[PDB]
């Protein structure tokens, strides 16, 4: 006669025989902040390690911060053997992964790249990447998930983003497909990518209503729909009703 | 004319359909031709609305009075409308 289930954010619903529905709310705020404010690429290894360590120390994760600093010293340096710490780095990655902290393991894998990629097998790396991506998507952190996918050291995880994400656009006047890298119609010889607001060629981002088949610059359409409910091109369509 | 058009567009001139006659106020300046045109358009819109409540009017006086037959001119101007066509 009882029901029980945690939610994502630590809240817990518990319905039992009197039946009374109670949500025992609290958790993972550290995970959200950590995922949001690491930098995984675009800077040298030392800078990335110091930034991540500063994040971990600010959030109160002293062990994570010292791990980042230790990685910086180990990698970004009558000397120690070149592969002296590889076993220890692998053990640290496995230690963080086996306790549910897949975020730290994936971040270290991405930051280090090939320095540790060849030492961890592909299957475990893919498992960590997928677990971290699922955690990020649960918290609705799409930007961090896509950054991880783009910077993923595994080819299979990288290919997860290129599946059915290409749009085939056609000219309305000619009803024929357009070139894959174009902004002018092949047949009609008309700038079919004209913004409905500014009447300028939309070379980059194009937002398109599915009702009236009209659109334009993403910012321009956003502003117009913020200021009105009609189609900017003027087809009597309430594209975003109310 | 370009600056006047800019100012009128900034003031939403001619876009008011609640009562069209106010558009000449939105024109900024006192233009007799604009005022006459907008008052005529308002009158014809009012006639269309009244007819709908209880096409040809938009054709203008020339087309309206073309079918006006059967009127007798008054020889004497007595000094004292419904008798008209």
């Amino acid at each position: 006669p009882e029901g029980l289930c945690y939610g994502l954010f630590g809240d817990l619903a518990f319905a039992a025989k009197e039946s009374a529905l109670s949500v025992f709310e609290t958790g993972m705020r550290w995970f959200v902040d950590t995922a949001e404010r690491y930098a995984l690429a675009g800077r040298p290894l030392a800078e990335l390690c110091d930034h991540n360590a500063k994040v971990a120390r600010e959030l109160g994760r002293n062990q994570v911060a010292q791990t980042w600093t230790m990685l910086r010293i180990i990698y970004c340096s009558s000397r120690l053997p070149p592969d002296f710490f590889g076993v220890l780095v692998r053990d640290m990655l496995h230690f963080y992964a086996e306790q549910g902290d897949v975020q730290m393991a994936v971040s270290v894998l991405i930051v280090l790249g090939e320095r540790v990629r060849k030492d961890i097998d592909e299957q475990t790396q893919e498992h960590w990447y997928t677990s971290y991506i699922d955690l990020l998507q649960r918290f609705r952190l799409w930007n961090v998930s896509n950054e991880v996918v783009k910077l993923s050291t595994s080819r299979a995880v990288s290919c997860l983003n290129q599946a059915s994400t290409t749009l085939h656009v056609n000219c309305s006047h000619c009803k024929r497909p357009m070139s894959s890298r174009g902004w002018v119609c092949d047949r009609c010889h008309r700038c079919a990518s004209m913004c409905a607001v500014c009447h300028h060629v939309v070379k980059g981002l194009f937002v398109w209503c599915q009702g009236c088949s009209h659109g334009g610059h993403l910012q321009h359409i956003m502003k117009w729909l913020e200021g009105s409910s009609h189609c900017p091109a003027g087809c009597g369509h309430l594209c975003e009703y109310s | 004319i370009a600056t006047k058009m800019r100012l009128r567009a900034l003031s939403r001139y001619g876009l008011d359909t609640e009562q069209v006659w106010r558009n000449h106020i939105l024109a900024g300046n006192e233009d007799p031709q604009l005022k006459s045109l907008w008052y005529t358009l308002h009158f014809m819109k009012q006639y269309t609305e009244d007819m709908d409540q209880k096409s040809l009017v938009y054709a203008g006086i020339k087309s309206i009075v073309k079918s006006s037959l059967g009127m007798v001119e008054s020889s004497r101007h007595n000094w004292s409308i419904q008798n008209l066509n």
Partner: protein, 304 residues
């Protein structure tokens, strides 16, 4: 934990509550043949955005599907059916397919993990666990029964293995609530073998002879071994360590809690698979967590 009550307004006892994938939505099924979907707003209050009659008999379990397949709900009931409900946009929920293969009551229904596609497993009271599949995720009105497994015991709970690793074969555990005087294992674990393309009984937990009311695989989330939580007269946690045909596991019990002092009805892991909540006949929710020495301890007692 801070407790807050919800005005369920359910005509009978609430049998199951299941959050969605994102944690922002809820689905509660009761014995009044009604399933209610709750969506919370920025104010934090849970609003019942949908309430429709589903089945003829009491509805036992309601489970969510991954959002990539859309807002999809599967509910099993006493009328030997497991219906699949989809949301179409107001908030209208439509029945897609009624799964009528089971000849007896379907105790539990659970969606398979995302990496398998859209697969559904239903366990019936006659000992048959049926695993379905939708070949086309855009056509939820067509479900094809892939496998059916005879568990030789009255099934009461199932739990997929949420591991997304390619090193772990598909695995479904089946618990039984049968109370026969004879002492036989009440939990059977079946692993899908790619070579045979058929589910085969991999491991059997002989130590569990009491009736089982709920089983729950722990979210793998980067681990290498599988952790299973079992609800019985006590709370047991088993760790399944694969060794280097069905895979052989070094089954070790790592927890056995009688703090409920009564029958434990439900067990539910959290997102990280680190804290386990158990709800027993005492009406208390006991959160169990393991320290770095693998000594599972109670981190809180929660009362209605």
């Amino acid at each position: 934990f801070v407790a807050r009550s919800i005005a369920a307004d359910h005509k009978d006892l609430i049998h199951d509550v299941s959050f969605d994938f994102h944690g922002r939505r809820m689905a509660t099924c009761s014995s009044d043949q009604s399933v209610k979907v709750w969506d919370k707003s920025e104010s934090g209050d849970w609003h019942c955005t949908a309430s429709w009659k589903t089945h003829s008999g009491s509805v036992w379990r309601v489970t969510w599907a991954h959002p990539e397949f859309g807002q999809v709900l599967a509910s099993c009931s006493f009328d030997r059916t497991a219906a699949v409900w989809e949301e179409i946009v107001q908030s209208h929920w439509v029945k897609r397919t009624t799964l009528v293969d089971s000849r007896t009551s379907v105790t539990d229904v659970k969606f398979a993990p995302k990496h398998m596609g859209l697969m559904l497993a239903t366990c019936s009271a006659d000992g048959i666990v049926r695993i379905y599949e939708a070949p086309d995720v855009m056509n939820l009105s067509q479900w094809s029964l892939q496998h059916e497994i005879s568990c030789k015991l009255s099934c009461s709970c199932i739990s997929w293995n949420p591991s997304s690793s390619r090193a772990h074969s598909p695995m479904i555990a089946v618990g039984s609530d049968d109370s026969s005087p004879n002492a036989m294992a009440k939990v059977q674990i079946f692993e899908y073998n790619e070579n045979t393309r058929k589910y085969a009984k991999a491991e059997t937990l002989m130590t569990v002879t009491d009736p089982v009311h709920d089983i729950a695989f722990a979210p793998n989330l980067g681990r290498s071994f599988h952790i299973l939580a079992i609800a019985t007269k006590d709370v047991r946690i088993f760790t399944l360590k694969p060794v280097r045909g069905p895979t052989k596991f070094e089954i070790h019990i790592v927890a056995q809690f009688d703090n409920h002092n009564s029958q434990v009805w439900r067990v539910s892991w959290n997102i990280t698979g680190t804290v386990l909540a158990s709800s027993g006949d005492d009406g208390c929710v006991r959160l169990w967590k393991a320290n770095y020495m693998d000594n599972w301890k109670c981190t809180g007692i929660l009362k209605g």
